[PDB]
Amino acid sequence: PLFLQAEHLAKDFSLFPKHSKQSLSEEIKGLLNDDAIQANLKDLASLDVDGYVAKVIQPTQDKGRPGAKRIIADLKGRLITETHLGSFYSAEVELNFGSRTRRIGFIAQERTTANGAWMPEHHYAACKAIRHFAELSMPIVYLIDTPGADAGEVANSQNQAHSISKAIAESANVDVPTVGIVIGAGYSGGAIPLAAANILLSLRDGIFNTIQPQGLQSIARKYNLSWQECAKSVGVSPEELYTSGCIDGIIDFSPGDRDERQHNLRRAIISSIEAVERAAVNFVRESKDLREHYDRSLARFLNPSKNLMALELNAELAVATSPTNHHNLFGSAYRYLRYLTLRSRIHSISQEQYGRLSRVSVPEGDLLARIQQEQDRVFQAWLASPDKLVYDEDLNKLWANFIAKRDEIKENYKKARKALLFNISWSLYHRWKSNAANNFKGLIQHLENLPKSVTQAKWPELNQLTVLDVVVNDELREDFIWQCHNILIFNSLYDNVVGSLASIAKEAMMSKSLSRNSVNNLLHKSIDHALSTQDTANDKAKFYKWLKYFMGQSNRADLLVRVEQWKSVGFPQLNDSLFVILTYFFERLLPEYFDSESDHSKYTGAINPVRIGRRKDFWNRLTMGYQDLLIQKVLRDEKRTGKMTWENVIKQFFTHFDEINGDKMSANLLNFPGFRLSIEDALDKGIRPCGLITGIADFKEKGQKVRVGLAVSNTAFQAGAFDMASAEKFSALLIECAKRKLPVVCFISSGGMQTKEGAAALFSMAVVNDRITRFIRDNELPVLMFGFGDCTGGAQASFVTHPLVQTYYLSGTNMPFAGQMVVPAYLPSTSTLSNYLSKVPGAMAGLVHNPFSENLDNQLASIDPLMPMPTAKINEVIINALSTLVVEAPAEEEEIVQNDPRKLMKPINKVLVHARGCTAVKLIRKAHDNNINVVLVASDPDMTAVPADMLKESDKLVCLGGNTSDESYLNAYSVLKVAEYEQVDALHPGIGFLSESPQFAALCVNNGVNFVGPSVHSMTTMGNKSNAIKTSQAQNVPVVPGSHGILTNAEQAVNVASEIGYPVLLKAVQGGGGKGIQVVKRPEDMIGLFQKTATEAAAAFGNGDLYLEKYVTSLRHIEVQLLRDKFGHAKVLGLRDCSVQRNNQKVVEESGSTMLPDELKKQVLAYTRALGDATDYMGAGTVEFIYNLDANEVYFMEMNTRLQVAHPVTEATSGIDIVSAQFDIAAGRSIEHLEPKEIGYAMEVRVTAEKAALDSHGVLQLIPNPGKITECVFPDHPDVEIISIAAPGKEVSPYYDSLIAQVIMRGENREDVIAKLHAYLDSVVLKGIATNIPLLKLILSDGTFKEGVYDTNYLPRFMAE
């Protein structure tokens, strides 16, 4: 069942991107190499935002750049057909493949018509062209270049979204190789039908993104950035798109090249089509289920059943329109491959996986203070570099008038003085825009607070004289404070009149004048509103004399037109007639009001629109614009009451809703500014950080239950903005519906695709649309799509309006192609509101009633009685949809089936061991002792290692290839393919490599392979450092004091560090092994050391996330061994002390701690049980504690969610075998029968192949000594255990660790264990290589170590002695 299989495989392939077989980037000949890509990443990192814009954004905007036809012509093939249709350009060219010539289809976005902006008929032409090439078995090269598909009134009237939803449906289901190549810009839903290819490439200077970079300006205004900053933060370069896995490589060609690089475009196409065809043949070799899918699709062409045959007639889709034009078996392979690549381009995580931010050192109401500080920061930056007064002739001529009239004999002085400051305050009001109110308050406060040595300061010479320098002088200072105070009241007056513009519009429609009382009372109310929302000392009478002075300036109309130009960005909801009457009120009716103050007969109030412009149909456009403002107001009242939520939508019709994967959420690997704060805020409110809620519900159809799928949009997160986690939840729901045979109902509301998830979010349009296309075409069950609230962007432009679904809308739904954030200017309710679109053909199967908004249909009939009304109910549509289906006999109910190892835990007689070295020798020895056959996997140096020699004829050895870890053990797909091939009973994930990764645990358990260790839930809870601390806090276990969540920035790190007291630690969340652990001594150091250690974490792991802990200088590293079964018996075996360590790596490890009180030992035993039971832990695990020697306290640090190398020390002293107990637990057995003891004492020395050598100051260090071992004797002794890979004639490899043996001594007491281990280390012989043993012998003959008085920093001090 290929529909179920493609989500399984694509989930597997997205768990480890680098070593997946979805990497076809090696195949294509003519791409740039990974070295040039790494070098280009270093340049783009070191450049600023302007250098990034020049490199990336400016060449795709270039009007001199070769078009789609010119690029296709310079492939130098033979053109067979062309179809130029506006900004669409389809073609068909024969290319030479060396063996012969071949027809290759083309569909391109042509930049030399409409800039590549596609219209509805261009999408319908792309639909047709994609079938036409499929019917003729022609491979297709898509060429992407667009500002996005048109969001205009004509597009949405022609049903733009419904043409794109079909175009994506054809592209996703085409039966020929599809290659995408970005030849310019790939923005939004116009780029995704073409970018939905098998292999998506880009030219060297191309771009691919969620929307055009100027559309990010709305999100830039909300968080106080520029749109250029938001564009770099999103990461839109071809190099960054290749790093995120959005594209499959960068072709070494730009459209203007005429050297060797012009030949790379045809070569990249030839090798791409050949690569997809070789890959698709390899998929038909290995997939026997691809035959079954093809035979099921063939059987529908043989016998077209009436319910799907009627859907194919109405939908017009790419089907077998002939037996000759019926697709081949490889045709279904291109659909399959295309889904796997689209679905591994999208990526999401879970709530347990996401690392929580620090609540510690965060002020109350912080958001407004941080935005105030950003507005002050940009204001202080203007105080540090203000503009010169020579730059504008209008301001320059007023300075000349001012200085001339200042020496002249007092009226002309006062006129020129006031006029200079006035035009400076309008100039800064044009400049500062949406933040102008805040920056004028800060300018007033600045001017009042200025030193007398700056207020009395005489002006610089004209060339160095700035607009700041002009107004800071005392003579211009306090009148400019007055200008700024009146401009604040004007900005409030203007914005209050804009929000009250409907009252003006009504009276203009019904009398053609705005009466004198209506302009008086609107002016009164707007000044009273301005001076009651602002406590400013400048009163109504002073502002009235300024308003007369302003209405006495000759450039007053020009000041209103300049203002209106930048205000049009913030108010894209008003039409031309509404902007004209707004301007006419300020320009003419306010002067006419003053002129008629002396004599009221001079007032007429008459709006003459011709004096602002000869706009046709002015009063009928004013009628439409007023009706649309009332529709906007009604939909804002509906948002503010908040009746259409996911809970309320469910309670109106459905009962016992069971959500599928409610924990799925945004990955956020671009880390967009303020978006992680929004994920935190959502989580603290209990809201899903995901644009969709999905589940299965009961619907009582005439008292009797019917089980249906239910997908309701989450208007509680980002107004229902659809996301990569929403796409995975939709695929999961359609899979549960395909398994159980459920009808699907959907309620969809969205602001569009989540732009703050990167360019990767776009692929969700094609992923979810393909799963709905395949769901109806393989499983027949009806999908309903009730568009509600605002239903816009890519959710609207794909799956909601898809031609096989029954599309519905609630009354009052806003349904355009894109929303207010992206739309440049006003769109009529005739082209946006679902009421007027109800009778427009193909827009919907019906407009239904909104069951929450009581009076809506009468409120809409009072706005326009000729508006089309709703007819059907949501209950009527659902009962008619359910009753016309065949009622198949329902199976007995199953739960939502998830990854559970406990089901897979069956008796083990053959096991895969994922390990090398001493860990593999230990696990191979335990496999013999438990009577289990080993399937061993190994690198080329390790095929002839001692763990391979320890195997029998009944045990297997398999070659992974290569020398290093990357070429062998870290390839998870090779290791899983061996587990599947040998049919292994379980897989032991070893130690090191992928042992502690919950992704590698999930990868095995997806494919039904038993993972020997904890559940994936237990691994993510105690593997995520913030959540491990939060679970410890919940179980009354003291943690190592710190931030407790993850730090945001250097200011956060300073404040949490100050509260703990310096010195302190900075640690990486994805760290471990002592990597990136920086000590910070001071606040002076912390500012530089945070930025530094964030770069260490980002370089080492690809995540700069730091979290802070208290630096304890005198400690013991105490760690406590847990065992636990599936039944819940937390058998805690005992502790170890691993304090003799060198660069965090443990060296001399012990079964007890000589400075730890028995009361604190009992506390860490109780805390291990509390954590083990409260996470539902399984297998072997080790919780780590800092035992502060100064404080006499024990603090939880972190947990090992796997087998620990120190384990044979506790095997001796507990009397319990840790690996045998873990193999019993992973066979499904209980460990209740075990009795943990405290048998004597034990100690381990890690014997490593290292030579002594001095550092730069002369202190002795140990460093690795590789080479062939000539002699190696470990004498047989009863109270020592030897795990070893050292023997005569074996080599110690430079590609791996110097660990050559673990020597674990046992004895009665600690002095006896030390003395026996000292004597045993002298009886042990090693030759050929050097070893660490000269140091180990001296620690065992130290007096301070023999007394047991030391700390974790003992060893580097002792090596210096």
Ligand SMILES: Nc1ncnc2c1ncn2[C@@H]1O[C@H](COP(=O)(O)OP(=O)(O)O)[C@@H](O)[C@H]1O
């Ligand atoms: N402030 C500190 N207090 C205690 N240990 C610290 C501190 N800073 C670094 N460390 C080292 O890190 C240990 C904590 O576990 P860690 O070494 O990070 O584990 P791993 O690297 O094996 O995951 C401590 O025992 C100590 O050796």
Ligand SMILES: [Mg+2]
């Ligand atoms: Mg450690």
